[PDB]
Structures are given as structure tokens and as C-alpha cells.
Design a protein around this ligand. Structure first.
Ligand SMILES: [Mg+2]
Length: 358
């Protein structure tokens, strides 16, 4: 349930708005955006936390070089504003999270399986369209309306507890209660809605007097933490070797070695490889050979036609951040998170000054 305080815990950390590339695969760590977080089609994540301090948007892309979104979050999805899962047939957006909080509206249009242990919304939750299927396994607190339309379904799993102001279900949609599930509604719905509920041994309390569950502590922690406390405005380092526009520090005390690349204005990967080769004193064709940390205040671009595989992390400390693939928008990036070694942690801390609040 703990959410990491330091940008070094993140597979991808963005100070400002984050726009991902298509066919992004992320394994381990967390992902954070201090502004709007736009996830492009074909995201496949298996991460601990996914945080946006703005709007979150999850896109779909029917190009045959693309694929479905499959987002698995072991702890928390946090969205300060609205979450919007867009719809492009015949794609799916599958999301499986322990805890999701959305401060404004949750709008699920793209088909997919959305599975939450606990859901907290400070507004409405709207599912619209064929194949849009949500399951709540334990708890949900929805301060506005739960709207389930146009073929969408919602399943309240056994012994779950769900608290909503209002419920609307119409247009070929269903709300399913499994055994012992408890639904509490502050109001009484219309006839059509009621006849769209399939109650398999649960209980519905209509126009019920109840208190909402409040989001777990972790939520207010995320809301009140300034994730870039202490951040300097010093430009990221550059050095004369390699590419004059980039800087680097290496840790060769392990094998494979670790390296941090700094690009104040941007980083492009073929230029990063020139910096890497110069710093390590050896030829480098790719990155699977290496633990790599890329830190910029501009965009990070992967220029190959093909998939880039890396181990490490990506940190943007600029106002906004795009991960771009210009060889072919579908080239893809696979990122396996790895914590930097202590010397590289210290180097990054020194050059940026981020000091998380204790
Ligand atoms: Mg250089």
C-alpha cells in the first residue's frame, strides 16, 4: 500500500504532462506524471503504482502493428482529474488494479475488462459501450452516479460493499451482484434500471442512509506530496566526450555496468549510444547490455525502426514530456525497471537536488 516518494523508484517519472509512445511495455517500478498522463495505444504494464496529477487518458489504436492495452497495477492508480478510456474497435483496454482513485469523472468507453479491488471516485463513474465490463472485488465508493449503458456491465463480486449516490443502467446493460455483495444507493432508481440488476444472493439498500468510505491514507499522501521538492534549475550536466550535448556518469563496479545519461534539452538514443560508448570506453550497438537511466528536461526519442529494449529508468524534469519513436511509430519500447546503484543514485541526487519530504 506504500507509494514511493523518490523519482528514483519510478520506471518512468515525469514532472509535468507525460505522453507515452505506442507499444510501450513496462515491467516493475511505478509510473508518475505531475500533469496530464496520456497513454498511447498498446500499453502493457505490470507496475506497482500509476499516478497522474492531472487528467489520465488511455487510447486505443486499431493499426495491426499495435495491440490491446493490458495494464496491471499492484497497488494504486491515482488520477487527480478525470480518467478516460477511449474506444477504437476492435481493441480492448484491460486494467487490473488493487486501488483506484479518481478525483473527477471515470469514463470507460473502450471495451475491456476493468477489475478493481477498491474503487474511490469523487464524482461519476460512466461505462458506455459493448464489451465494457467492470468488476469490483471488495469495495467501491462513488459520490456521484454509477452509469452503466449501451452494453456495459458491472459485477459486484461476493461480499463486496459498494456505496453510490445513484444508479442508472439502460440500453442492454446489466449490474450483477454475486452472493453476499451489498449495494447501497442514496436514491432510488427508475424501473428500467431496477429490472437491469441481476441479484444473485446479494442485498440492495435503496435510498439508504450510510456513510461513504474514505480513500485510504495513501491517497491524501499522494495528493499532498510535492514529488519534486528541492528540485534545482541548474541545467543537467553535459560533458565534452561523446556527444557534447549530453552528460554521463558510469558505475563499473558491477557487471553489467550502470550508466546515467543526462540531456538537458532532449535525449535521442543514437546520441545516447555515442555518449555511452565514450564513457564506458567500448562499442555499443544497443542497451540490453546495460543498466541505463535517461534523465532529460525535454523529450526522449528512440530512432530505430525496431523494438528498443532497456533496463533502468526514464526521468523527465522538464515542463512536459513525450516518449517518441520516430523509426516507425509502432517500433515499441520495453522497459524493465531497475533501481540505480548507490553511486548513481547519489550522482542524480546531487545534480537535481530532489529531496523527498520525510
Ligand atoms: Mg558528452
Amino acid at each position: 500500500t506504500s507509494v514511493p516518494s523518490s523519482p528514483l523508484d519510478y520506471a518512468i517519472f515525469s514532472k509535468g504532462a507525460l505522453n507515452t509512445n505506442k507499444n510501450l511495455t513496462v515491467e516493475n517500478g511505478s509510473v508518475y506524471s505531475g500533469g496530464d498522463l496520456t497513454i498511447d495505444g498498446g500499453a502493457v504494464f505490470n507496475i506497482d503504482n500509476l499516478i497522474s496529477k492531472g487528467e489520465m487518458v488511455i487510447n486505443q489504436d486499431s493499426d495491426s502493428r499495435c495491440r490491446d492495452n493490458n495494464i496491471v497495477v499492484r497497488n494504486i492508480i491515482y488520477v487527480e482529474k478525470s480518467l478516460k478510456a477511449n474506444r477504437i474497435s476492435p481493441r480492448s483496454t484491460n486494467i487490473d488494479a488493487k486501488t483506484i482513485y479518481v478525483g473527477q469523472e471515470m469514463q470507460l468507453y473502450g471495451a475491456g475488462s476493468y477489475k478493481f479491488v477498491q474503487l474511490f471516485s469523487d464524482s461519476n463513474v460512466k461505462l458506455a459501450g459493448p464489451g465494457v465490463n467492470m468488476e469490483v472485488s471488495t469495495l467501491a465508493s462513488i459520490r456521484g452516479t454509477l452509469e452503466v449503458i449501451d452494453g456495459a456491465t458491472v459485477t459486484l463480486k461476493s461480499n463486496s460493499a459498494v456505496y453510490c449516490n445513484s444508479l442508472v443502467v439502460r440500453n442492454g446493460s446489466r449490474l450483477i451482484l454475486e452472493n453476499g455483495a451489498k449495494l447501497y444507493l442514496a436514491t432510488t432508481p427508475d424501473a428500467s434500471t431496477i429490472i437491469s440488476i441481476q441479484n444473485n444472493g446479494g442485498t440492495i439498500s435503496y435510498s439508504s442512509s450510510f456513510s461513504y468510505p474514505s480513500p485510504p491514507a495513501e491517497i491524501d499522501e499522494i495528493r499532498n506530496r510535492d514529488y519534486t521538492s528541492g528540485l534545482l534549475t541548474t541545467p543537467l550536466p553535459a560533458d565534452s566526450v561523446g556527444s557534447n550535448q549530453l552528460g554521463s556518469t558510469a558505475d563499473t563496479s558491477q557487471t553489467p555496468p550502470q550508466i546515467v545519461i543526462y540531456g538537458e534539452s532532449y535525449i535521442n538514443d543514437n546520441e545516447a549510444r555515442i555518449e555511452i560508448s565514450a564513457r564506458l570506453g567500448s562499442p555499443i550497438v544497443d542497451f540490453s547490455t546495460l543498466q541505463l537511466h535517461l534523465i532529460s528536461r525535454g523529450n526522449i526519442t528512440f530512432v530505430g525502426g525496431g523494438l528498443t529494449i532497456m533496463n533502468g529508468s526514464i526521468i523527465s524534469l522538464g515542463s512536459t514530456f513525450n516518449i517518441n519513436a520516430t523509426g516507425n511509430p509502432y517500433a515499441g519500447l520495453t522497459l524493465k525497471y531497475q533501481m540505480p546503484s548507490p553511486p548513481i543514485q547519489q550522482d542524480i541526487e546531487s545534480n537535481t537536488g530532489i529531496q523527498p519530504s520525510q
